[PDB]
Design a binder for these strands. Sequence first.
DNA 1: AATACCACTGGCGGTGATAT
DNA 2: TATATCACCGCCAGTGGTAT
Lengths: 92, 87
Amino acid sequence: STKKKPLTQEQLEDARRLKAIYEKKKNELGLSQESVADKMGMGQSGVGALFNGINALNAYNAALLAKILKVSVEEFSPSIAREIYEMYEAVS
Amino acid sequence: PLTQEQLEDARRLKAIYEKKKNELGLSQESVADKMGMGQSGVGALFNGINALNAYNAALLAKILKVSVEEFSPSIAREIYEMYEAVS
DNA sequence: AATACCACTGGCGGTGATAT
DNA sequence: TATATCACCGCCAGTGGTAT
């Protein structure tokens, strides 16, 4: 319905990429979805939604997660990385 | 209402538009066309009615030929921090 | 003319509980 | 325990129509 909009195919692949990085690294980083949520100031279901392709990433959340997982945003979402780069061109 | 800093940002932004409009041949509708939105929406931003976010601020900066920091140092800072994650 | 004003609404960005 | 999923929705940025 009207309340929530489904993600594009591209947003879906971005989420699969993100969740795989999280799985590969949650051990070495000592993470949990609940700790990630805390770091971001949301609950486990908010993070679960991003990881599972229910809610889409925005530039801000993507940047935060990249930092938490210690990767660059482009390793999961090249398109958001590029939107972030184009915004940067307006500051620099 | 928006915060005092958000209101200042809007005042800086409109001042810039007022000053460069003639040389750049702009109007609130043409700037709106350029951002994919309507005159009403643009007017709300210029007038401190709706808050600016990083994307719209970056578009506006490019349309006005200025840097984001010229109207909103706080947003410029946010932008830079996201970039720290793409680097 | 160009801009400002008004009432309104889709969908972003979540929540807590429950199921696995 | 950790995660995945479910029902649910506040809020406001942007709207189109109109007034100045």
